[model samples]
Target: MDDIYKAAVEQLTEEQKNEFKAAFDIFVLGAEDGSISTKELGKVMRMLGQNPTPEELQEMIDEVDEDGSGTVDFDEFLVMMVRSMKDDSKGKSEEELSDLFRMWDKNADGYIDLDELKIMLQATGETITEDDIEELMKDGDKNNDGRIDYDEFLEFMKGVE
Candidate 1:
């Protein structure tokens, strides 16, 4: 495992390796020998306020699995990080996120309040129940201030995708 990890870091810069370590540690916790499980991935998604169905979890697992082991090793995860970094759509994703935040903020107040959230959800035409709206607000309002600013919106949108 150590040899494989060292090999994985060879192609990565100090910053990239550090970032990968940080994200991998979030899934691995204190110990470092084990690979990341789909259950852990689901928990990560859940913590970010996104519901992870088993199908979704399995899909992610398959995408990250390189050895057909059904789990993500450090090297496998690093592959994903490198691939994502190489994607041209990352900047597009940022632009889309900003545009989405602008629409959610509505009155250009730079914050998404309850009224704006309700209106935004209503516009989805998905028949969101009242509790659904409440949950959305509760999950997105990280500071508990009953409003989602740009940073909060950005983080939530990242998890959503």
Candidate 2:
């Protein structure tokens, strides 16, 4: 495991870990288990530093079910947990995050594609070239889909620390 994963797991209390494990098991049931209810997702979000409303929980469910499967599997659950936990911090405000996202979005296309990412890194004086950016994108493209989505971007950012 990397430092972030190690830190995240270490940050969790024993009780919280137990709760998360139970929730993870329930979430694997694909809606067959009533334990994977909206309330349960709300609790998970709270653990990730966001107290989402019922509507927000529904939105999260919708976002996680990319294929419209109406249920989230372990991979989806992991992505959600990792991305949300990575984004939550003690100092940075939500507005700061929004600004970062916008600054990285070079094309103004509402998404940070590879070209945009390269430009952002160069502007930040990261000593990265276009080829380096492409290699990094390939590594972070967990789905092997040639494109790094927002969650993949978040995971990559987390790895930088």
Candidate 3:
């Protein structure tokens, strides 16, 4: 095995090793160039008899951002994905705050439009007005694209965690 894998094995518990191995296999087969797509995640969830909503998937991504980097590297990816799956098996995988953001990005366009943001805040009973949405958009749009992408979404989730 490579040094990275060797180090990973040594650091993980026996149970974690098994879980990571299974998750890693699935990731290797489905991920494209080391990134997991939403569709690919959906397929794995189905195979595992778990139906993860878009929000849930997004939350998992957010959970993997250990250093607030806004994106998940392979190690973070493995840990988050496996731990979530382990939780799911026991019916204990409650959605995290990041999931709420993912739910708001309705179209999966990698960004949340104004209307989508408004709808999401409304659904959560946040009592947010158009002005509130604008303010949030201004702060949340780290890339200054007038929308929130996965990175920005992850950062938002990090605050709650």
Candidate 4:
């Protein structure tokens, strides 16, 4: 299987990669199941100067905590890091993305079409043509269905950088 850390390592700087590896190594020891628990993740967030609200933190865990395991394993942590790196240490929390998702989901359906996608991008102060929007969508739309579900919306959040 591919290394769980591959994506994160590739995207992070040399120093960041080293730090992430060490942090993961060190934190897992404190976790009985060998995954970063909600508490441990909060600690990690604090070190990064983030103080996510309870709901926000839960949103984060929900995003990348694959398998619905309720905690972040190494692979999950890697996914979270890739997504988190795009947001400035003090900017655009996942909570905001959730809000944006709700705003664009005008149909009250679970999915947002491409036109709505552009509006959400605009709300974030991004300017791009519809063509480019499709490219961005490609990064997150795992099923290639041309509409972004909430899960895909969260994935899109990771790629906005």
Largest lDDT belongs to which candidate?
Answer: 4
Q: What are the per-residue Cα lDDT tens digits for candidate 1 across 24-91?
A: 66666767476767456455445534344556656765675446676667666666455434435434
Q: Relative to the unseen true structure, what is the C-alpha lDDT of residue 19 in candidate 4, on a scale of 0 to 100?
A: 64
For model 1, give the 10-residue run with minimal summed lDDT: 83-92
- Screening candidate 2 with a backbone cut-off below 3 angstroms (N, C-alpha, C), the clashing residue pairs are none
* Total backbone clashes of candidate 3, pairs 3 or more residues apart or in separate chains: 0
TM-score of 4: 0.39
Clashing pairs in 1: none
Candidate 3 lDDT over residue span 48-92, tens digit each:
566566556667556653455554456655554554543333532
Count clashes in each candidate, considering only residues at least 3 apart in sequence or on different chains: 0, 0, 0, 0
Worst 10 residues of 3 by lDDT: 85-94
Residue 27, candidate 4: Cα error in Å is: 2.1
- On the 0 to 100 scale, the lDDT of residue 115 in model 4 is 70
Overall lDDT per candidate, in order of appearance: 0.65, 0.59, 0.59, 0.65
Off by over 4 Å in 1: 1-93
lDDT-based ranking, best first?
4, 1, 3, 2
What are the candidates' C-alpha RMSDs? 14.9, 16.4, 17.4, 14.9
Per-prediction TM-score = 0.39, 0.35, 0.35, 0.39
How well does candidate 4 score on lDDT at residue 87? 44
> In angstroms, how far off is 81's CA in candidate 3?
18
